[PDB]
Amino acid sequence: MFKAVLFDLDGVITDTAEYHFRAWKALAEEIGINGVDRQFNEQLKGVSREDSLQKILDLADKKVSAEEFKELAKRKNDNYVKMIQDVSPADVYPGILQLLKDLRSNKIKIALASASKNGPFLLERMNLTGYFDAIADPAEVAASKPAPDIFIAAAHAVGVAPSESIGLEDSQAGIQAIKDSGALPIGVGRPEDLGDDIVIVPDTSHYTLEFLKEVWLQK
Ligand SMILES: [Mg+2]
């Protein structure tokens, strides 16, 4: 049987995407650039703060100083950090709390493998800290998803090999990272997005200890 479950945060435990979008739209409004809508925002997911700001500046072909660029990026993040002050246990996705309770009682390690620089803060605010045996520090990983580094780090931090672990993710990049770590991915979402070759559930209410055990045995 598997020995650990490696969780991403956004799209698995809770939603951070909505707050990122609001922080970028607020910032875009302040400097008078139109076109930062949820459709545009798809081009911001999975990219660096700097690269996302550059994409928003390209909308208006706006140039800034290196100093102003750094300030705008910082403002966006300060805005983001203010908005996530609202996060509570009410924002934990369906099934996730009960899953973490069952894993813990069954002595299965729990690690976060998130690029969130606020993962620890966000787990405290949702009252989940007590379930996690490790959080992989994204500032200490050389390469982002779809590179496996952060899933490897999360597994090593709880004393297992990725080969002994299940990884939970909703993103193409995330599923590819889990697969290349040697962990077994279980996707949440749509086969059209995440591939036909892995087990996928429509939503997190299906991520149960019993379902995870069935998947591991079946391959
Ligand atoms: Mg995700």
Residue numbers in the entry: 1 to 219
Study authors write:
Titration of lactose into βPGMWT had no effect on the 1H15N-TROSY spectrum, whereas titration of citrate led to equivalent chemical shift changes and sharpening of line-broadened peaks to those observed in milk. Both monomers share a similar fold and overlay closely with a previously reported substrate-free βPGMWT structure (PDB 2WHE29; non-H atom RMSDs of 0.56 Å and 0.95 Å). Although only one of the two conformers observed in solution is represented in the crystal, the NMR experiments show that both conformer A and conformer B remain well-populated under physiological conditions.
βPGM is a monomeric magnesium-dependent phosphoryl transfer enzyme of the haloacid dehalogenase (HAD) superfamily. Two phosphate group binding sites are present, a proximal site adjacent to the carboxylate nucleophile and the catalytic Mg2+ ion, and a distal site located ~8 Å away in the closed enzyme.
